[PDB]
Amino acid sequence: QISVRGLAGVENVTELKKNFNRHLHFTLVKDRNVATPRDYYFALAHTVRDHLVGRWIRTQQHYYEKDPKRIYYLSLEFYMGRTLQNTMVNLALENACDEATYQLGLDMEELEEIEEDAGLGNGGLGRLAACFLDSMATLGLAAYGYGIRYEFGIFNQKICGGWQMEEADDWLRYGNPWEKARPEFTLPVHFYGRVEHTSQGAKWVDTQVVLAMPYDTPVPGYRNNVVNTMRLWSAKAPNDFNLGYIQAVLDRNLAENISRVLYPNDNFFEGKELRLKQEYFVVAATLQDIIRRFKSSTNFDAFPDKVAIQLNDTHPSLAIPELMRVLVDLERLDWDKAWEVTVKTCAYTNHTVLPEALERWPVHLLETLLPRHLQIIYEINQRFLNRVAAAFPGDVDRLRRMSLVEEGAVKRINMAHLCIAGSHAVNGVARIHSEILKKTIFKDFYELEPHKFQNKTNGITPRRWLVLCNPGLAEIIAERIGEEYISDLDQLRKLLSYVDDEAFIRDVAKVKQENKLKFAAYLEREYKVHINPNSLFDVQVKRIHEYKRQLLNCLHVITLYNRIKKEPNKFVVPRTVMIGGKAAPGYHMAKMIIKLITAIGDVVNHDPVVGDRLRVIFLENYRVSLAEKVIPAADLSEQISTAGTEASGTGNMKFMLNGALTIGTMDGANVEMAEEAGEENFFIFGMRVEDVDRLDQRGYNAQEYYDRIPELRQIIEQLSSGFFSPKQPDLFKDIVNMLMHHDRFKVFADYEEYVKCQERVSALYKNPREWTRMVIRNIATSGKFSSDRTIAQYAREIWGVEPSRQRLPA
Amino acid sequence: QISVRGLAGVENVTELKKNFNRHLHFTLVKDRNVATPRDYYFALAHTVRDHLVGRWIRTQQHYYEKDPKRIYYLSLEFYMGRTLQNTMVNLALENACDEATYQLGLDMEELEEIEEDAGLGNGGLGRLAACFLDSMATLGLAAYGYGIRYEFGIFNQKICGGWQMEEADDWLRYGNPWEKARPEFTLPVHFYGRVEHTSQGAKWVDTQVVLAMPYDTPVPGYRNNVVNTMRLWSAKAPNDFNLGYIQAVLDRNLAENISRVLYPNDNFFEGKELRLKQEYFVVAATLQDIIRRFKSSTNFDAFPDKVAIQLNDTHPSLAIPELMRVLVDLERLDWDKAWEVTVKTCAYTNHTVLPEALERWPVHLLETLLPRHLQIIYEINQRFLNRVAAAFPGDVDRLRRMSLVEEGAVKRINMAHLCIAGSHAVNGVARIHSEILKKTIFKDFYELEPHKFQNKTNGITPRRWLVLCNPGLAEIIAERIGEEYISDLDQLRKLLSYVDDEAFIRDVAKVKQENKLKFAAYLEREYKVHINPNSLFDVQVKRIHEYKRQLLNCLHVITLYNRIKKEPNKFVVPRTVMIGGKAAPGYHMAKMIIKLITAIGDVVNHDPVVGDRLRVIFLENYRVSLAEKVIPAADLSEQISTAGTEASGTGNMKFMLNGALTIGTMDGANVEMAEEAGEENFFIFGMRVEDVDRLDQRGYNAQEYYDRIPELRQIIEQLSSGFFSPKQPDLFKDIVNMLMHHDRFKVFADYEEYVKCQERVSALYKNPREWTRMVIRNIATSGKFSSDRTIAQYAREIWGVEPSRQRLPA
Ligand SMILES: O=C(O)C[C@H](OC(=O)/C=C/c1ccc(O)cc1)[C@@H](OC(=O)/C=C/c1ccc(O)cc1)C(=O)O
Ligand SMILES: O=C(O)C[C@H](OC(=O)/C=C/c1ccc(O)cc1)[C@@H](OC(=O)/C=C/c1ccc(O)cc1)C(=O)O
């Protein structure tokens, strides 16, 4: 049908059809009389997988012979989503499979919807890891993603009576055709025990052993025949575990609980022992595997020439002392040489400045679970503080501020400080965030070791986030400038010469409308909800957090409603306001925010005077596959975090690439987006980081805003009195109290400028041609925000490897 | 190589080689550079499986179109063993695959050893179920095995310091290529709750739901292209189970523990709640599935014309009240019609008379777990006792003896009584056992309903137990009489005309010696133990139990040792005494018996005066795959249970088919074996059932034997004083005390006749030609003990179906 989806040749379509029938018969044990739609999805998955594995084996052979420097990306989260369409896109198979399945009497898009998301992440951090794997393979780097194969990923969210309900995400129920178990690489991991000191150094003895069994998933580059590996570890009890008999067998679950479930916290630290066991489990098994592979290539001087380890946040921070443990205790290297190797091998990426997200583990936990690692951490700390003391003599307070050990009620280990000391590079994820790191939280560390600090602005993969989810837009672009931009997103600048092109303007607006019609239909089918496809699609999708300020959005929605009620026969640009995202199960305030949203919807959506001029919808179960649907249908992207709180954002970049305009604060990567596109092509409002600091020094008083803004006052009174909760008038008392007396994120302070800025958006939308021209200017300047650019910078400036766009033979 | 293993044609070998290479590459993602031996086994397994599935789909199509009466074999145990070789044998593929793998540079026998046993059974009862599935498919019956997919089967036994140690049998670690998950047939099973009475009958409400997910395994008939289905249920928690969040997810294990582990008790009842949950789980899911399939063929009058349910022991006895529950509570049939259907549908096979093996569930357990089923059982009991009262008026004690409810300290339900009342047929498993049922334990029931009681003597499948494990013997037989006997074992009688044939005599003895040499080599390779292959192979393999009297064997071994020590330079027929079998983990006395055996071995095997005239070996980890090795190498089969205790035995039949002679008591199927072969061709000794009864009435006094038999006295003194345990002189005090004061199985009473009979065995073995002629007379008369005969009798006399040896088209 469309060009970017590849060729549908006679030979290929015929071959695909027969392999599909072979898998249906031999693999699935079905025929066309008894096959379920799920059987048809699996037959297709297995057919496409056949094309992957040939390239998989020769990629691993290639790396084995060439022996390049290997990149190890360590993450507790890989937010992968669905695999089928992505694989077809990167193998140029999509049109062929579409034709082949059509000829078999099947709809391929219907089959695609049967695949479960691999939801092994919470939000931005986990999805970044997934975009990274894609870019590393597309750029021909010998890279491996290492994580945990959670049995249950992020929970499925159901909305019941307006409340979030959680259910288990049993994503492996029907099986995963993409993974391959590798029990020959099963490795022991140790916990508890104690430390013995002998003539020849320390020994960690009397430990409980848990086995780590790897499962490999292929990661295909874009049309270069490169297929990299993501290795995920599963926890297994040894066969003599606890070995009355029956109970001993049932208690195996205790060891195997390590890989059972993903902690559903986004940007929030929860200091639970099971979480620590997960962090050590992935680190211990991975490092053993890395070393095995290095040895099967004695000389550890060359270790950093052949290995790079990237730590995605502090979650895998135990890699630093674990590498020291292995080098010192097992390999018998002296401390100083082991440390040189460790530092040169490791690098650390910081994802947030929020204090509640920082990992600070109680010493008593590490003392019981990992007694040897505590000793190593203490020794790392001693030697590090000796260097600080020599550089800044007499500065006793610096010493206490930089210590990896925090004193107080309970002693804690600061894992960020451990990471900085043990890494040769530390990076933030957007320019403003990286500057904040040098100026505030890691200022002392930057003064000691300035060379260590870098910026690597985040990116997203244009394969999943353009070609896959928005084929219509990728096609009208390729008609003008060709296909090369897909793996070289900077080429989108060539679209600037089409900003006055009336044909192109018409096509861009046409693609958007098609996307909006298709999403409006999806809502009626799956969720029985009616919306006007001619209204402005106003969308905020991301995890529910106070710092992301879904509440600010709520205040605007209510403002519009009250304005309509006051002047009903006055014209307003119609809007569909869509808000979606999951709240962490223990995050009470985030759960109340969801309830507020739906409660606003209950009043707004059923007021006869409003009509179809304003609709408020909560998008249930927001996840990667839903993002692929809603993002291409958006007109307006809400990126409204308080300045200084969102380290980067990546959802923002997804919306920019797909033809939505942005309303946002000068925060995270919004700053660089506005810089690329030009400030006039962006809807910027609110306090800058500097204004927030000014307000903090003065003291934030929310009452002042309530007293001076009558419209804001009306909203607070509506909330307090029970306008949005008739049967439970005090339902939202926690929200009001928080807004009035302890709002860390200054919602009221940005209200006036937000409402005013929203008016400017409505004004532009009234002029379709000028809306679309501004859109074209955004799409055309989004090239910087490709993760191919991000990864190339990591490769050159951190890992010391050169990327390659050169094909491997098919 | 050998004829019975089928044709190795040019077209077939070429096709097998390319599919093997296809699976290695595409399925396993390997090439010849990186493949492990385990990868090679899996490539072969997947290649052979391809040939199965085609026949599988058309067998299920056949049954769907013809709509025959379906046989449902309900068992908590299916002791299947390995599947690869069995599949090749039944598909006539063995020689072809042997050639194909040879040409690829691989040894097929080495690959076969990599497959894990499916050890989902304890002993005789579970292995019978497996032989039955094989015969039902070979005889073209539309039969389904229904059970539980245990994650851990019977434990792997390790012998450490002479003691049994247990380890988890993680048989699914590497995956099972034979099974197919069928999540479209996932069914809810209910537990706990309470009973509500409405206008329209009772309702079972407020229940905990556990999901049952089926896994199907193919069961191929012998060269008839019939492939039946074994469906095994796996326990799954629903996705909203217990839905802080993390703990709720981790607690899913509570529901899923139902299918976790097989209870390792052989002929012993353990009244634990988890075991009851297993029994209900398999019954509830199966009956729902049976009914679904019946409806997808309203009219339940015809239900018994289309369905037979066979209960393997009382383990699935809850099928009776569950069928009543479904028919009465859900389908709204009146009690009397529901009951007529139930009785006509169900039949019950009893496997033992031992009181400690009988299932008697505490009423308080059923009251909490299954409140509705208790009500139904009480109502079944009331109506049943009303019939007894009418048939035997005034006989108040009969009423209490026949009641399904047992009174006392704790009220219990007698599940055997439930089975008899709710079944149209009740059978024992050998003629003597069936007579004992009518005369003793079920005498009252037989007087009420004589027509209900039948015999169905057990059998074994000649495919696994001759062709597969003893190809050498199957081949010399086929040379004389053809191949037809393999599915018609009676034809073995034709071998009687070869008893004086000097060529045949030589070949039989040649096959045995080859088997003994191969097993002697297996012992040195896998267990580093040296044995003389020219000695008489004296073997007792079976579960360790007091009733099976491994202890009697031990007394004989010690007698031989003491006789050698007394007269060292006197000639004795050399023996290798092999004893093997698992003890239930909580069975203390069985564990002591194992320790005694190894302790005897420690003394005997290292006495220089003994030499290679006597060796005592404990065969570790006895299981189906080990049975396939040791049985063809045996000269002497020990079948020495106290008369009246072993209901049938099946190991006895395995040894008879494979050219070993039998020393045994007139117990179980030994009686019919001796009858078939002729008493002169069997080594019979000891008390008959009648002699045991005489001794019981008089009072068994072990002291009498100790006082009158000096040799027996010496052994007891050796045991007591510490001759076999120097460092722990009192180690075997429990055994001696049991033998002297509370031996339920009268070991001393059969000692004299046993030793004397053993002398007659040694005498015959001195004359190879006459030994072999007696062997030929055993093999030639073993035809009755084919499970094809057993199943044909079940089919005609219980299930009301006609077997068919007619091929389906390939
Ligand atoms: O990168 C991955 O996805 C997994 C690694 O795979 C490989 O390195 C495979 C190398 C290879 C593949 C195919 C060949 O024909 C030669 C070498 C795996 O390594 C191996 O499995 C290596 C196997 C092997 C290589 C060479 C040899 O002589 C024997 C076995 C690992 O380190 O986990
Ligand atoms: O016996 C088994 O091993 C499983 C049963 O399989 C079958 O009965 C299959 C029947 C069949 C197989 C192939 C055909 O072309 C037609 C019918 C299965 O039944 C089905 O899956 C039936 C599927 C089906 C039959 C007819 C129809 O029109 C739709 C679906 C069951 O009852 O568990």
Swiss-Prot record, chains A, B:
Listed GO MF terms: glycogen phosphorylase activity; nucleotide binding; pyridoxal phosphate binding
Gene Ontology CC terms, in alphabetical order: skeletal muscle myofibril
Sorted UniProt keywords: Acetylation, Allosteric enzyme, Carbohydrate metabolism, Glycogen metabolism, Glycosyltransferase, Nucleotide-binding, Phosphoprotein, Pyridoxal phosphate, Transferase
Sites of Phosphotyrosine modification: 192, 215, 446
Modified residues (Phosphoserine): 3, 403, 487, 720-721
Catalysed conversion reaction: [(1->4)-alpha-D-glucosyl](n) + phosphate = [(1->4)-alpha-D-glucosyl](n-1) + alpha-D-glucose 1-phosphate
Enzyme kind, highest EC tier: transferase
Recorded family membership: Belongs to the glycogen phosphorylase family.
NCBIfam families: P_ylase
Described purpose of this protein according to its UniProt entry: Allosteric enzyme that catalyzes the rate-limiting step in glycogen catabolism, the phosphorolytic cleavage of glycogen to produce glucose-1-phosphate, and plays a central role in maintaining cellular and organismal glucose homeostasis.
Self-association state and partner proteins as the record states: Homodimer. Homotetramer; to form the enzymatically active phosphorylase A.
UniProt-recorded name of the protein: Glycogen phosphorylase, muscle form
Gene behind the chain: PYGM
